[PDB]
Design a protein around this ligand. Structure first.
Ligand SMILES: [Mg+2]
Lengths: 155, 78, 124, 24, 72
RNA sequence: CCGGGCACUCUAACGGGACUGCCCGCGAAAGCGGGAGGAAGGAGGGGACGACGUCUGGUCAGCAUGGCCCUUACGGCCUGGGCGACACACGUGCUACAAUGCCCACUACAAAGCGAUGCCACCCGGCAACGGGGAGCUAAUCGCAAAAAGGUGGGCCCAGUUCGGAUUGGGGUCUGCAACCCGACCCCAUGAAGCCGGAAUCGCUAGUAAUCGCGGAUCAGCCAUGCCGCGGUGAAUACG
RNA sequence: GCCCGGAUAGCUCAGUCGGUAGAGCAGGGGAUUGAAAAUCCCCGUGUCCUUGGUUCGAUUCCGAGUCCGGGCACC
RNA sequence: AAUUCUGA
């Protein structure tokens, strides 16, 4: 990617919610391109939402995905024999990708044997500011700021 | 695995057969490791060819369905 | 319920329990079940003495399973250890006897790797 | 799995037919 | 050679070294009438082959000595 | 499925169209950015094609051929053994450690190729592999053939297990004169290690990676998980 | 024998100047190098050897018991 | 801030 600034592939709007983002989240739950056996789980989670909080799985998204967005993380560099892993801002685009990813991984960690349960629950704890995905958020934010010593390295 | 027959070479019977009448000596050289040892043969030792030389292998009850090649090793020091 | 030998499986379907017996698998499972009107989707947790002893019938009476098959299987191998046929050996030596690649993969019937080596590539 | 010779895919991956995959 | 004729080997000494080859090799071979068989092979044996330890692969020559002394 | 019909689908043959031609921004031009129109843009996506030359690379064992060597054997034939040998060690691959799962029952959608001592519709026996009969097919007209994952509903409920299938014991079918070495499948019983893997390390920027199945070649049969093609679903990231 | 102090994280030590328990090093996960550390974030672990009395009760306030640490003699 | 490759 040395010539062109690459291209931001387009997300097809959801086919139930109509969100170009409610799909980006399913895509990460898609193993082997089986979007049917993936979106199913997701939609089976939205029913665990409406069956454990009148809150429509919509604000449980715009909130759990917003309380996970890391403002700044660490991206290492080397000026020459310099093992400086500088902290810096995050591209609004990147933020989302890092979020969704940590959300799936975290989901895939809970002890719930089924699946949608895990996604639903992790979405609840993350909206309610206390999910394993946010644990990685603060963990990442600790590294950040704590190294503001390298502020003159904003490449 | 065979299904209709016992694919036992010509010279096998032709030879052995006369040897069964009164129970002859024993020394019966061979090159038919691809056969079978049907009963009545008991006692009569056969000089099976392992590819290099003749092995004086004795015959007893238990060993029946087995073949001649499953009694003359082809490699050494296993 | 002490069914065959010393095996008391519970909390599971009375169709997989028989599998946990040396000499019984999926086959003979959904076999003694049809030949005894015993619904497979039930449990050892609840079953009439009749179903037990009846099971002990079409099981411990049909094919004489652990101990005695075990005793026979070894007896056959023991027979292969009479004069020593080709199958007899390779068994006497504890190796596989089904025409297989021994130059590599075979740790199953090979007694773990004993890296006992020593070849070289560059002295003085 | 694709090596369990006593199932559906057991024969699919194998390319044969048996008691565990009769001829339609 | 001494394992084909039937004789028995004892590696009294073998020692590697820096890059590749061998520094010193002292072996004891037994069996009936053994010295008389390895007595003629007592000298310096020359080799001529493409050098593997070269980039161009040039044709090179190598020398190595073989001494023989019985156990009296 | 009938007669009947070329409007579709498709099949194969010849053409159009895209060229930075049209608008606007930059530049002297070349050229670049963006916008529209258009099914399609700035080499639209793939092939095929790979310069003077390097590597005294590899290939006398595909063939040819200089030169050296043997010619009642360094040639010719034959039964049989060996190339498959295992205390070890490295590479490419296959199946897995599982619940986005496995097993069970029912029902659907492809493409590319391939079939006369050849592929086999459908019955009957055998749980089956497989065996009888026999029709159709020189094949856009009959068959190989069911695609699979999936959709669908019923039970397992996290235990090395209904996961995983190595190994071993018993029984059979099929080619082939002949399956001990040394074949492929069928059934029963065996159910070992493996709970994502130290140091290191491989591929891919899009219908790509991953996953799923189908065909062909050689060939009596096959150790093909290899190779060459075909198609179903179908991502993340690229600041620099 | 007399005079003084003290064990609490694997180790070393602070501490309502009475309720509310803590640091450094060890250790683990990650982060992690061209290679180990140096950078870098996050957690479990207890009557403070310890015998109690006042205090509402005490890791800290009295006696005092066991041992530990440091000094002072005589013989 | 990290050595070496003989001799056709
Ligand atoms: Mg040197």
């Amino acid at each position: 990617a040395r010539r062109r600034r690459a291209e931001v592939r387009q997300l097809q709007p959801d086919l139930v919610y109509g969100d170009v983002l409610v799909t980006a989240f399913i895509n990460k739950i898609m193993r082997d391109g089986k979007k049917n056996l993936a979106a199913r789980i997701f939609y089976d989670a939205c029913k665990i939402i409406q069956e454990k909080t009148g809150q429509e799985p919509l604000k449980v998204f715009k909130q759990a995905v917003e309380n996970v967005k890391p403002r700044m993380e660490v991206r290492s560099r080397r000026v020459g024999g310099a093992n400086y892993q500088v902290p810096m801002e995050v591209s609004p685009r990147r933020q989302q990708s890092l979020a969704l990813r940590w959300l799936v991984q975290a989901a895939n960690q809970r002890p719930e044997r089924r699946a949608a349960v895990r996604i639903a629950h992790e979405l609840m704890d993350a909206a309610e500011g206390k999910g394993g995905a946010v644990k990685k958020k603060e963990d990442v934010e600790r590294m950040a700021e704590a190294n503001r010593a390298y502020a003159h390295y904003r490449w | 695995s065979l299904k209709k027959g016992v694919f036992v070479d010509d010279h096998l019977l032709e030879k052995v057969l006369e040897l069964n009448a009164k129970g002859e000596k024993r020394l019966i050289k061979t090159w038919s490791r691809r056969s079978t040892i049907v009963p009545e043969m008991v006692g009569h030792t056969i000089a099976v060819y392992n590819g290099k030389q003749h092995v004086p292998v004795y015959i007893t009850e238990n060993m029946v369905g087995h073949k001649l090649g499953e009694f003359a090793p082809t490699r050494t020091y296993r | 319920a002490r069914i065959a030998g010393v095996e008391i499986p519970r909390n599971k379907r009375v169709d997989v329990a028989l599998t946990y017996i040396y000499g019984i698998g999926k086959a003979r499972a959904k076999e003694a079940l049809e030949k005894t009107g015993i619904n497979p989707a039930t449990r050892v947790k609840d079953l009439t003495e009749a179903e037990v002893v009846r099971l002990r019938e079409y099981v411990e009476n049909t094919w004489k399973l652990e101990g005695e098959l075990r005793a026979e299987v070894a007896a056959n191998i023991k027979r292969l250890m009479d004069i020593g046929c080709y199958r007899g050996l390779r068994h006497r030596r504890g190796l596989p006897v089904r025409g297989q690649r021994t130059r590599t993969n075979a740790r199953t019937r090979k007694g773990p790797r004993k890296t006992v080596a020593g070849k070289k590539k560059a002295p003085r | 799995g694709k090596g369990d010779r006593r199932t559906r895919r057991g024969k699919i991956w194998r390319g044969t037919y048996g008691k565990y995959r009769p001829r339609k | 050679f001494a394992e084909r004729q039937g004789f028995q080997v004892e590696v009294v000494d073998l020692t590697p070294g820096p890059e590749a080859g061998i520094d010193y090799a002292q072996i004891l071979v037994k069996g009936e009438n053994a010295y008389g068989l390895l007595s003629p092979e007592a000298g310096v044996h020359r080799l001529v082959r493409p050098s593997p330890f070269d980039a161009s692969g040039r044709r090179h020559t190598s020398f190595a000595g073989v001494e023989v002394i019985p156990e009296v």
